[PDB]
Coordinates of C-alpha atoms in Angstrom, one line a residue:
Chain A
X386 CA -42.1 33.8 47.2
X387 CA -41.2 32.9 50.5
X388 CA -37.6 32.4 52.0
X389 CA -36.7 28.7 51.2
X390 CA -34.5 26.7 53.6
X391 CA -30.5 27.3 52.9
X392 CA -27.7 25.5 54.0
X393 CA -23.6 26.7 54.2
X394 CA -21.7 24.0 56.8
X395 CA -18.6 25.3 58.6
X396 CA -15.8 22.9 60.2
X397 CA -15.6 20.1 57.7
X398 CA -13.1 18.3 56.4
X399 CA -13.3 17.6 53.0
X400 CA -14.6 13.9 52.9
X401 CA -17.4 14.8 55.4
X402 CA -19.0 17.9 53.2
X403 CA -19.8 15.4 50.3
X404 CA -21.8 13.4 52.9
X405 CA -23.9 17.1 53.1
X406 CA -24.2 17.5 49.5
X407 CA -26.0 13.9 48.8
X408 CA -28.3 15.1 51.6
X409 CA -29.6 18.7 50.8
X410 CA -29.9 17.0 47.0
X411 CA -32.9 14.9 47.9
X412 CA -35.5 17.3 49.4
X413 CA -34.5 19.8 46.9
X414 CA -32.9 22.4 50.0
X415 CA -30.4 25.0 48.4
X416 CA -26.9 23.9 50.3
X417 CA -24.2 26.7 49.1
X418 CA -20.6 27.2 49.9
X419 CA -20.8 30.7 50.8
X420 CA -22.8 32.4 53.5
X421 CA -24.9 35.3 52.3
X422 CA -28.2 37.4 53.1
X423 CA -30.2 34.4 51.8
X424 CA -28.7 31.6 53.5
X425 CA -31.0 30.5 56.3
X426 CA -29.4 27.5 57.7
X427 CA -25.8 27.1 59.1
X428 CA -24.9 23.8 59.5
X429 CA -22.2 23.5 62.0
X430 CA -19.8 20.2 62.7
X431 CA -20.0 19.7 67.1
X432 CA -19.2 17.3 69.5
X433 CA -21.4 15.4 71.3
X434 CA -22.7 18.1 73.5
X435 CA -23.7 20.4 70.4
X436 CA -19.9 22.6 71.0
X437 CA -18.2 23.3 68.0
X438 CA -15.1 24.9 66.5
X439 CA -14.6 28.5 65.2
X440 CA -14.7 28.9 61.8
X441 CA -15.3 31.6 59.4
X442 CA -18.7 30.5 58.7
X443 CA -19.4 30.0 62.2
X444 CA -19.6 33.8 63.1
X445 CA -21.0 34.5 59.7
X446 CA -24.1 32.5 61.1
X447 CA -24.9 34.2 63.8
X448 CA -24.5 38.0 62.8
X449 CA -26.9 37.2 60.5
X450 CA -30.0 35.6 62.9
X451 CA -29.8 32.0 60.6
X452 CA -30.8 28.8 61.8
X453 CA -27.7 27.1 63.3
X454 CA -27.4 23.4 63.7
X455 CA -25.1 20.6 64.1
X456 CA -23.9 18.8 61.5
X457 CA -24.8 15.7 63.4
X458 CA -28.4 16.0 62.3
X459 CA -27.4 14.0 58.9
X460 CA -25.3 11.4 60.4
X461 CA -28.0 10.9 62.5
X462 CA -30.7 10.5 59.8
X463 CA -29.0 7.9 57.8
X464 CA -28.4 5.7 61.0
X465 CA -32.4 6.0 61.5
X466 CA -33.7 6.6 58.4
X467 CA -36.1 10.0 59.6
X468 CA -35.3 13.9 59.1
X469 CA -35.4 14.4 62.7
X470 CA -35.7 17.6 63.8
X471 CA -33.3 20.4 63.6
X472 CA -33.7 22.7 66.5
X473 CA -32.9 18.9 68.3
X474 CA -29.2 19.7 67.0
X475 CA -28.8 23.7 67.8
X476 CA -25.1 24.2 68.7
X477 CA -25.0 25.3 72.0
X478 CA -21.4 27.0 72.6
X479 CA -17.8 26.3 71.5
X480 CA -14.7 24.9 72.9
X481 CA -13.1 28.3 73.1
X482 CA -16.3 30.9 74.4
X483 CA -18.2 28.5 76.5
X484 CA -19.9 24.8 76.7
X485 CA -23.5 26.8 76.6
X486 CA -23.6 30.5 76.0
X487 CA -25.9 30.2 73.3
X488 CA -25.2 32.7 71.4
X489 CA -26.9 31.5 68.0
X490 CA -30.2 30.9 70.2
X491 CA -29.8 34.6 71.2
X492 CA -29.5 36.0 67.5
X493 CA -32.0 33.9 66.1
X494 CA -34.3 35.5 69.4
X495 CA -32.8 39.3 68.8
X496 CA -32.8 40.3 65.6
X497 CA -35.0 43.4 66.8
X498 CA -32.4 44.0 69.1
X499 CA -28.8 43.6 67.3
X500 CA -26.1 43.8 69.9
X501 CA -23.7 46.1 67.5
X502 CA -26.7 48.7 66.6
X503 CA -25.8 52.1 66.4
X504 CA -21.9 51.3 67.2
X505 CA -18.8 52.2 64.4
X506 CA -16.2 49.6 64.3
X507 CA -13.4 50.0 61.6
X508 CA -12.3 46.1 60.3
X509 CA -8.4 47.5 59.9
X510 CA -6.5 44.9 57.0
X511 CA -5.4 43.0 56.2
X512 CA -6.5 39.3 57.4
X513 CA -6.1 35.9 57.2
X514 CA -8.1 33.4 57.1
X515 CA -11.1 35.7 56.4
X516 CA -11.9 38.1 53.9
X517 CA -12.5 42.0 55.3
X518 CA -15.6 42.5 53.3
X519 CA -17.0 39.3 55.1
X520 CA -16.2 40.7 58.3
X521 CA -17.3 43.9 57.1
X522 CA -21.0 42.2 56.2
X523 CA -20.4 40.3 59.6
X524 CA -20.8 43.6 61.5
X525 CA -23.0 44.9 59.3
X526 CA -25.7 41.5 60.1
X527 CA -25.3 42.8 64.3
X528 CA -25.7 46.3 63.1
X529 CA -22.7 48.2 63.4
X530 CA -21.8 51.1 61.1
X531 CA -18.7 50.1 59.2
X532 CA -16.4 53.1 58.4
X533 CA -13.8 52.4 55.7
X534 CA -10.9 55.0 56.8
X535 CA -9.5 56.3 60.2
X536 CA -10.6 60.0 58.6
X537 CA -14.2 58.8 58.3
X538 CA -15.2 58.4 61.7
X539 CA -18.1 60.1 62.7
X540 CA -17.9 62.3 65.4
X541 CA -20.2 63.2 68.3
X542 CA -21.0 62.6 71.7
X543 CA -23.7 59.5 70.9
X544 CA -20.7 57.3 68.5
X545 CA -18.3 54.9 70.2
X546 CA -16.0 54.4 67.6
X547 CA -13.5 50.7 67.6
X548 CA -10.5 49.6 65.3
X549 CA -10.2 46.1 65.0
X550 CA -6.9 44.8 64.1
X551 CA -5.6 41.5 64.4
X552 CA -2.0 41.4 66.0
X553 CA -1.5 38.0 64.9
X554 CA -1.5 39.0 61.4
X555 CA 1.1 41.6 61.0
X556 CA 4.6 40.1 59.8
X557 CA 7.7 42.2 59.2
X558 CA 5.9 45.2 61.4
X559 CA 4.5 46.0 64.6
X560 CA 1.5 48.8 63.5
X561 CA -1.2 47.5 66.1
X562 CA 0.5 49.9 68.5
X563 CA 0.2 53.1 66.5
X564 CA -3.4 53.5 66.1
X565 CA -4.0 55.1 68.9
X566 CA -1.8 58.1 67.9
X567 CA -4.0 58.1 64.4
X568 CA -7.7 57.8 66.2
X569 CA -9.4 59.0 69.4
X570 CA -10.4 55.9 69.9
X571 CA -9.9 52.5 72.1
X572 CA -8.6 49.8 70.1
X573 CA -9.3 46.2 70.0
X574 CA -8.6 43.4 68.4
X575 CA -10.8 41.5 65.9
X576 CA -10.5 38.7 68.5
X577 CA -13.2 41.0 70.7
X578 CA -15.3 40.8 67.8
X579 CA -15.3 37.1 66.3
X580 CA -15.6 36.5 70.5
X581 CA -18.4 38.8 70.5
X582 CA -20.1 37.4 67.8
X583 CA -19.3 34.1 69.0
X584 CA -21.7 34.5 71.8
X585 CA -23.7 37.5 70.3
X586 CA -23.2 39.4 73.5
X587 CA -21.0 42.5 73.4
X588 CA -18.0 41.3 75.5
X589 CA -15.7 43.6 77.7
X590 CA -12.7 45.6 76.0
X591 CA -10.5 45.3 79.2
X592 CA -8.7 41.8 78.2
X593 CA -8.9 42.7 74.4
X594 CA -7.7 46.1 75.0
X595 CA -4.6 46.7 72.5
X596 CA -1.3 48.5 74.1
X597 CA -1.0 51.7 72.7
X598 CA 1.9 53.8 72.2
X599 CA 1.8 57.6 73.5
Chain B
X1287 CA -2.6 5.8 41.2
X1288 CA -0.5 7.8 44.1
X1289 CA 1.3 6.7 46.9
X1290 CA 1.9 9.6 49.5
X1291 CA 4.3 11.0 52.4
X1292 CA 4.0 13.6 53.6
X1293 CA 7.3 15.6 54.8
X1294 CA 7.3 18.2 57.5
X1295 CA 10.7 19.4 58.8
X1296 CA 12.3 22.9 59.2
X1297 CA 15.4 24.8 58.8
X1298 CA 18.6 24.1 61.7
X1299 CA 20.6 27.2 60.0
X1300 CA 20.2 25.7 56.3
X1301 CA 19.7 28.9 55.0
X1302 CA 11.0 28.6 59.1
X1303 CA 8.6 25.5 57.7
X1304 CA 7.4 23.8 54.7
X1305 CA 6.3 20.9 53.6
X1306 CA 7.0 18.1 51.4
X1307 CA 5.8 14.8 48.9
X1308 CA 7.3 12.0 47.7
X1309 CA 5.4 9.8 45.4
X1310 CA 7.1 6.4 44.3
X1311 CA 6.2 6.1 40.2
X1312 CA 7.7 3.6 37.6
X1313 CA 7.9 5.8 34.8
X1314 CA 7.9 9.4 34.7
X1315 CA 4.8 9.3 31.9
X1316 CA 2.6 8.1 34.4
X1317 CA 3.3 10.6 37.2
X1318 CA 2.0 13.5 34.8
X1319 CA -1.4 11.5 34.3
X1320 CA -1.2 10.7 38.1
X1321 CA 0.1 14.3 38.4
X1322 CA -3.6 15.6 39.7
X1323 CA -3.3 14.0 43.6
X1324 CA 0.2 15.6 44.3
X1325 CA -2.0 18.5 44.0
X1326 CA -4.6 17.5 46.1
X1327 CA -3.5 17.8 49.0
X1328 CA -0.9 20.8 48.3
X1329 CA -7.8 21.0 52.2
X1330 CA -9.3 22.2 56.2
X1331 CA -10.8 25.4 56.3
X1332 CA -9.0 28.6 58.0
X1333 CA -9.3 28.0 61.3
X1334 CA -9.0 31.1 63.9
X1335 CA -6.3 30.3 67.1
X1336 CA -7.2 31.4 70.7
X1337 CA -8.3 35.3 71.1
X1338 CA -6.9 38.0 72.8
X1339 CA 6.7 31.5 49.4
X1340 CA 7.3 28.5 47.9
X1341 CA 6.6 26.1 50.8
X1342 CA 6.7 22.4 49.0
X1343 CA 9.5 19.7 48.4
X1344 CA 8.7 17.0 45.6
X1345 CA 10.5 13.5 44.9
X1346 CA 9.5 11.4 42.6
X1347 CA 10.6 7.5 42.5
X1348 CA 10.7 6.4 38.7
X1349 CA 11.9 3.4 37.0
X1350 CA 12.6 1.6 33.5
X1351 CA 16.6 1.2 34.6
X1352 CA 17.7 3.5 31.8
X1353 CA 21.2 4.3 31.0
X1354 CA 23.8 6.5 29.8
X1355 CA 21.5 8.8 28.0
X1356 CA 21.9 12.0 30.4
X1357 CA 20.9 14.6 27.7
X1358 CA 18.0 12.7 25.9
X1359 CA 17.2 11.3 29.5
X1360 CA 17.1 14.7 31.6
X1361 CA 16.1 16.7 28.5
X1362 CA 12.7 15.0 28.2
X1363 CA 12.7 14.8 32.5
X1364 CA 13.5 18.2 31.7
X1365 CA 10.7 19.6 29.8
X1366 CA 8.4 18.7 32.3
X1367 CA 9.5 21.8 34.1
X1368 CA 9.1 23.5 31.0
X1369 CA 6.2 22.6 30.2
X1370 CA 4.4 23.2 33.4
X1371 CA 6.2 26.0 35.3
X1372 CA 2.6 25.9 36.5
X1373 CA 3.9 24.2 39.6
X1374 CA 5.4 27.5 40.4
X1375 CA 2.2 29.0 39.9
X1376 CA 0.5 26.6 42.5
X1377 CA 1.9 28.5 45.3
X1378 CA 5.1 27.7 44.5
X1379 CA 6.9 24.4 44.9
X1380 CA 10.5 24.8 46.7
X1381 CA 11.8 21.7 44.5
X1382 CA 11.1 18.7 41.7
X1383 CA 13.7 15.8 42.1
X1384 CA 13.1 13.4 39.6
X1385 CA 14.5 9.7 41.0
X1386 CA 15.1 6.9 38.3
X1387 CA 15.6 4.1 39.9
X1388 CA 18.3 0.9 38.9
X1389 CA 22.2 3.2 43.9
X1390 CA 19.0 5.3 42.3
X1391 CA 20.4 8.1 39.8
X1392 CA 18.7 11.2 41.2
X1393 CA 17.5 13.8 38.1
X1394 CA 17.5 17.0 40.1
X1395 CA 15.2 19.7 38.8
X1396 CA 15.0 22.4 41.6
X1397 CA 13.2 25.6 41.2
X1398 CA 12.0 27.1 44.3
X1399 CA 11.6 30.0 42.3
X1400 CA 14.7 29.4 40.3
X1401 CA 15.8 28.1 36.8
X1402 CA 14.6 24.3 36.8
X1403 CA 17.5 22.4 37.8
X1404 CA 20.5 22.6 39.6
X1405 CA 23.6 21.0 38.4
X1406 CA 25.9 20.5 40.8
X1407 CA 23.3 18.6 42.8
X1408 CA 22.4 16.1 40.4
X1409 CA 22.7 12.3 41.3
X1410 CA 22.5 13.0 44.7
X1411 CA 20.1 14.7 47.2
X1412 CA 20.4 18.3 48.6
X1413 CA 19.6 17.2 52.3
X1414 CA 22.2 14.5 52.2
X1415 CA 24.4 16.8 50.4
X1416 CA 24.9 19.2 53.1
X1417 CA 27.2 16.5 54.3
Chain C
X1386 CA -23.7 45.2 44.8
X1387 CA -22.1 44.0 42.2
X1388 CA -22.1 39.6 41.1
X1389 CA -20.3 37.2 42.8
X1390 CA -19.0 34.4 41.0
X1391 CA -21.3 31.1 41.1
X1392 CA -21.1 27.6 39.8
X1393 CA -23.2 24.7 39.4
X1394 CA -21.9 21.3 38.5
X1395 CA -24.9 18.2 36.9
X1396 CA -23.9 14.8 36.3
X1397 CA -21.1 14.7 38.7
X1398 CA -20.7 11.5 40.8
X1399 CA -19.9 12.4 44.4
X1400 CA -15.8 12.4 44.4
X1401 CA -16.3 14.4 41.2
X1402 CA -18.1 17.1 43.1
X1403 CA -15.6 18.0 45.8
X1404 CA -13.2 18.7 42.8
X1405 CA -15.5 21.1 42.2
X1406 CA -16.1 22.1 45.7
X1407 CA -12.0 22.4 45.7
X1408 CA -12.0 24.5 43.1
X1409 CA -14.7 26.7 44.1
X1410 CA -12.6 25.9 47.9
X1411 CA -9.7 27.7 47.0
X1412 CA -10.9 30.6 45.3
X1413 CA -14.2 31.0 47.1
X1414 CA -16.6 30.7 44.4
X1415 CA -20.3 30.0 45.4
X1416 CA -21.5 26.5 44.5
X1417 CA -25.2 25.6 45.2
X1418 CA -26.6 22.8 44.8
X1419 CA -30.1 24.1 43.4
X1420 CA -30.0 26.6 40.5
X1421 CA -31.6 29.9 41.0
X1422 CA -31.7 33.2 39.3
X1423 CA -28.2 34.2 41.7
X1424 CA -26.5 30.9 40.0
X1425 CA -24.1 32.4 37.5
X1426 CA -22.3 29.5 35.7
X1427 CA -23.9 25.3 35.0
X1428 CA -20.9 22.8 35.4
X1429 CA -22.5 20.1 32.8
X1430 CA -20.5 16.1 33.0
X1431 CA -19.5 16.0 29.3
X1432 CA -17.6 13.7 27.1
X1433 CA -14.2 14.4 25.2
X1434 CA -16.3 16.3 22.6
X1435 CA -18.1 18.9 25.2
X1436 CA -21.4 16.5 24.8
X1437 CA -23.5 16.3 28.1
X1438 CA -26.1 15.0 29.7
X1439 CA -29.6 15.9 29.3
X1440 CA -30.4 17.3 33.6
X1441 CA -32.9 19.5 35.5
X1442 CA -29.6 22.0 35.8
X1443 CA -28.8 21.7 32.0
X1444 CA -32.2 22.8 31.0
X1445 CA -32.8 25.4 33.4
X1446 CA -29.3 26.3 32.7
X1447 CA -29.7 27.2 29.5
X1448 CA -33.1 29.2 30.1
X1449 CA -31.3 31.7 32.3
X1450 CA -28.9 32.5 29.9
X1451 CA -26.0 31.2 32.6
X1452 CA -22.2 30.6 31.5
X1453 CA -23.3 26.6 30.6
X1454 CA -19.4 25.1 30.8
X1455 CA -18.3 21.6 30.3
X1456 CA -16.8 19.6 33.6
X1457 CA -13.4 19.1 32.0
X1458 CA -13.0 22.7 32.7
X1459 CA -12.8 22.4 36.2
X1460 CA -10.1 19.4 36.0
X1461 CA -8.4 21.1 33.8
X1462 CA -7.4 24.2 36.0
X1463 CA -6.5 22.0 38.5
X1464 CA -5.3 19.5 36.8
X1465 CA -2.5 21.9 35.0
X1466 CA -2.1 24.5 38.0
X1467 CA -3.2 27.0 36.3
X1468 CA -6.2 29.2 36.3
X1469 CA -7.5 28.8 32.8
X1470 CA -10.2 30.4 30.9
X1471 CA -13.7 28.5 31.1
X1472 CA -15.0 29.5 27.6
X1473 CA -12.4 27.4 26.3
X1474 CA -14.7 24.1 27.5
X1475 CA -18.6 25.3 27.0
X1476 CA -20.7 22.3 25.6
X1477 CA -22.1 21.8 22.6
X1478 CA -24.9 19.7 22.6
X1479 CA -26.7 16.5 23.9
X1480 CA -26.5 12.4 22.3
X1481 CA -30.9 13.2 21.3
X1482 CA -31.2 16.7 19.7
X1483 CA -27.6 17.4 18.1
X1484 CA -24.0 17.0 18.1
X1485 CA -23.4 20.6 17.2
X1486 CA -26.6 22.3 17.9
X1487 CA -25.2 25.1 20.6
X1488 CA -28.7 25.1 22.8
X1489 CA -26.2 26.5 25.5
X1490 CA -24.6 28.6 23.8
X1491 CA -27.4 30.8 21.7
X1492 CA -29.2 30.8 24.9
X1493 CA -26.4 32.9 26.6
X1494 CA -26.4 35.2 23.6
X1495 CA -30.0 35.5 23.0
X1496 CA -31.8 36.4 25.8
X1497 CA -32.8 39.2 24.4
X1498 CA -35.4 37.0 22.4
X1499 CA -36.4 34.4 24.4
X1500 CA -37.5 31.4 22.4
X1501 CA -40.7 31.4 24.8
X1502 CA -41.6 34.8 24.7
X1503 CA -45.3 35.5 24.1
X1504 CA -46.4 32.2 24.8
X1505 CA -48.7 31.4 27.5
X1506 CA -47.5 27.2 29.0
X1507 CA -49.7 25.0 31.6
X1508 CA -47.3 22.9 33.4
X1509 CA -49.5 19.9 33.6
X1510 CA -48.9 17.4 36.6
X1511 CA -47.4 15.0 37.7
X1512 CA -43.6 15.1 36.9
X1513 CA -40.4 12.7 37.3
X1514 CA -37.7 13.9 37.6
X1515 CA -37.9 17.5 37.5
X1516 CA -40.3 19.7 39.8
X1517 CA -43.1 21.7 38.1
X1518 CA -42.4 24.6 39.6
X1519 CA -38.9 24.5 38.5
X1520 CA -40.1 24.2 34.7
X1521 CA -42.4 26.7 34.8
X1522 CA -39.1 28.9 36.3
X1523 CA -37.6 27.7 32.5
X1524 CA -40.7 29.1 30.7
X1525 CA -40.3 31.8 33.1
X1526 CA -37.2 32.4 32.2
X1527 CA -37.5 31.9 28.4
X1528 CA -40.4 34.4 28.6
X1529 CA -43.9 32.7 28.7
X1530 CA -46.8 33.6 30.8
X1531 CA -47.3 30.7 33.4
X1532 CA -50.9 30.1 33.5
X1533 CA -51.6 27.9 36.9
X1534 CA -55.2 26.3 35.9
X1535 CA -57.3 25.7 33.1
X1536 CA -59.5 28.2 33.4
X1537 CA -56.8 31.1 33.7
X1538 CA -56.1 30.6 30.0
X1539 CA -56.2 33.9 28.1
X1540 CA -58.8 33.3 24.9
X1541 CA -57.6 35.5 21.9
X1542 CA -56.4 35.7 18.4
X1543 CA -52.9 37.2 19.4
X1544 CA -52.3 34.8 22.4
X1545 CA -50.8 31.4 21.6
X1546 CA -51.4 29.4 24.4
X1547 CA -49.8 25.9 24.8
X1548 CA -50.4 22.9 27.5
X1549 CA -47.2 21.3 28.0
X1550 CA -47.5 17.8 29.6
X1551 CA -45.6 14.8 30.0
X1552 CA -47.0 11.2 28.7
X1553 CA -44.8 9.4 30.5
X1554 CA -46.0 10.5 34.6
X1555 CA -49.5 9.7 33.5
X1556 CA -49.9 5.5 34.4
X1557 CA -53.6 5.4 35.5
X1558 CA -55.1 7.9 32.9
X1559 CA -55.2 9.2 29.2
X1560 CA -56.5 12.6 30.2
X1561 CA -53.9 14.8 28.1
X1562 CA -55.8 14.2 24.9
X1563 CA -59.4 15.5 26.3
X1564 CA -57.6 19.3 27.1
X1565 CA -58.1 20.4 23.1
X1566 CA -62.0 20.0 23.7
X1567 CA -61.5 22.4 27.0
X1568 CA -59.1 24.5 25.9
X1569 CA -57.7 26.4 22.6
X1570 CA -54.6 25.4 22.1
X1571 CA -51.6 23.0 21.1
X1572 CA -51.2 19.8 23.3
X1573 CA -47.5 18.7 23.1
X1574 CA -45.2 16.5 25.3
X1575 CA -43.1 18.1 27.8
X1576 CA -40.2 17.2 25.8
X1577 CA -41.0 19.8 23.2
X1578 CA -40.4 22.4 25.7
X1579 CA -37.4 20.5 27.2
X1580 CA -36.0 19.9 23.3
X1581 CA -36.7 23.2 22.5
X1582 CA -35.2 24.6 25.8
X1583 CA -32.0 22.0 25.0
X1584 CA -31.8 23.5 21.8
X1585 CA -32.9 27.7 22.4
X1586 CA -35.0 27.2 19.4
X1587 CA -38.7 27.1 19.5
X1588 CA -39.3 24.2 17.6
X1589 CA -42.3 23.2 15.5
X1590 CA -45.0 21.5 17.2
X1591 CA -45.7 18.7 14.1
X1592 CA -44.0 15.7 15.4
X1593 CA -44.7 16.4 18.9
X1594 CA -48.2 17.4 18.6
X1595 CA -50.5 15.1 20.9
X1596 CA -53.7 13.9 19.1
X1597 CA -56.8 15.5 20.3
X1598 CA -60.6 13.8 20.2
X1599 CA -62.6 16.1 17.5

């Protein structure tokens, strides 16, 4: 067997998914809910100019080198009555990252060459709005070495170890500034990393770097 | 079979955000059939901002102009509650007022995460009440 | 790795599905919209008495030995705000083979003896309303050896090969009572397979043998 084309869309409101669903039904394409290994198609919801909105999903896509298009591609069919094609309706960037830093293109392009290779990055709980382990398999699709506890970093001259945190998450405490007391290590937060992945491109610590407390 | 509004207001020193549904019904039966839209919308996927508790009121509008009844009436209102303390399981609802209409005699049933209803606030509204 | 959970819904109009999708929404369950061998549960559109429709996701369904569970159960959660068991709702048959005959149900719990096994089933073009290559993943699945031609069909005393075809795709032709003079063995309707798949029970060729030219 070969792979098989796979759908997950990211960004929709509820009435717009069902439009999705009738669509994938009729040339028998698998369209799940959930991203995994064997999705190859992330369908994402854009403006006009192909720019879309973070989501879950979204980053999900690109860590793992799927096919990455607009949602606009069925809209479009029904108006015209054709499957045009896909790579037509490629998201380009979003509103928060940048108008075109194609960073899907890149991933699709790289997958020899995963930005995260060889790097350890600890995903530090808890979360909203997405799950650790998916995170955790986000890192995993651009290669980085996930390492569960602060204990378990691996240490050598070659490894350039990272906790992500998210700052906006904590309520009732303020333990994003006590890491670096626990870890020889800069810390970021997970920000750096759904931006990084965002654009597939390994952006700078400096404006993500997290205040520590000596 | 629902009407909706949607409430979104917060706390001036009441005691920060939730929000709210009132649903206008002519008999409390058919609210429990038409119970499954209340819970619709109780929606958008997580969203991420830039980089760098129960939460919901319910009133319900009801008809068929009863009368003196209060035990039989509220009892039955009541066991509603009772029955499904599953809206406390839906992520918690802050309160059930059940409104029987002809002023409109208000059948408060209150559980935030408390017994069902309140006592000293029934026939009249806990927002207006304050007053 | 251990399973996720997955659902599949059949029969569903399209507002029906998002309650699906919102169930799946809020907890995260994997819904697809093609049933593979990662599909865990089949959602099947039944009565008040757990009585379904006969679909392409029913059948196959059952041949995978998948949690087969009646729509209502879905509402039902929702519909009471709970999170109530799914067992409680499983279907119990189809309005042309039985009321009560718990295809389904023995499938689930019999998959250790596959009502298939040991057989050896042509998939004989065209079909309506379900792809060949998704019935021959039911045979498959219920054990027999998928034999893609004619002339790949073992000859022996211990092999019982059967052509399975469908009467009604065949318009311009009567060509599915000539394959007993080519080949050695039984020449049924594909309904046989599909009855005995709605059923888990291999069921006995006489009233759905196809009359062959001696």
């Amino acid at each position: 067997v070969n792979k098989r084309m796979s759908m997950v869309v990211s960004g929709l409101t509820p009435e717009e998914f069902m439009l999705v669903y009738k669509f994938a039904r009729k040339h028998h394409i698998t369209l799940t809910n959930l991203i995994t290994e064997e999705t190859t198609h992330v369908v994402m919801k854009t403006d006009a100019e192909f720019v879309c909105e973070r989501t879950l999903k979204y980053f999900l896509g690109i860590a793992g080198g799927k096919w990455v298009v607009s949602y606009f591609w069925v809209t479009q069919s029904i108006k015209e009555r054709k499957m045009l094609n896909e790579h037509d309706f490629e998201v380009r960037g979003d509103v928060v990252n940048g108008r075109n830093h194609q960073g899907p293109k890149r991933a699709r392009e790289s997958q020899d060459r995963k930005i995260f290779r060889g790097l350890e990055i600890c995903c530090y709980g808890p979360f909203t709005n997405m799950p650790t382990d998916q995170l955790e398999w986000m890192v995993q699709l651009c290669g980085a070495s996930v390492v569960k506890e602060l204990s378990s970093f691996t240490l050598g001259t070659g490894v350039h170890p990272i906790v992500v945190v998210q700052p906006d998450a904590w309520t009732e405490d303020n333990g994003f500034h006590a890491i670096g007391q626990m870890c020889e290590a800069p810390v970021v937060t997970r920000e750096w990393v759904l931006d990084s992945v965002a654009l597939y491109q390994c952006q700078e610590l400096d404006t993500y770097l997290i205040p520590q407390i000596p | 079979n629902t009407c909706v509004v949607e409430f979104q207001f917060m706390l001036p020193t009441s005691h920060c955000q939730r929000m709210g549904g009132m649903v206008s019904f002519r008999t409390f039966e058919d609210f429990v059939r038409i119970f499954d839209e209340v819970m619709g919308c109780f929606p958008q996927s997580p969203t991420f901002p830039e980089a760098g508790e129960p939460i919901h009121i319910l009133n319900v509008a009801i008809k068929t102009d009863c009368d003196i009844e209060d035990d039989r009436l509220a009892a039955m209102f009541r066991e509603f509650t009772q029955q499904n303390k599953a809206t406390l399981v839906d992520h918690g609802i802050r309160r059930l007022t059940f409104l029987v209409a002809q002023f409109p005699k208000f059948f408060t049933f209150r559980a935030r995460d408390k017994f069902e209803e309140d006592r000293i606030y029934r026939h009249l509204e806990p927002a207006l009440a304050f007053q």
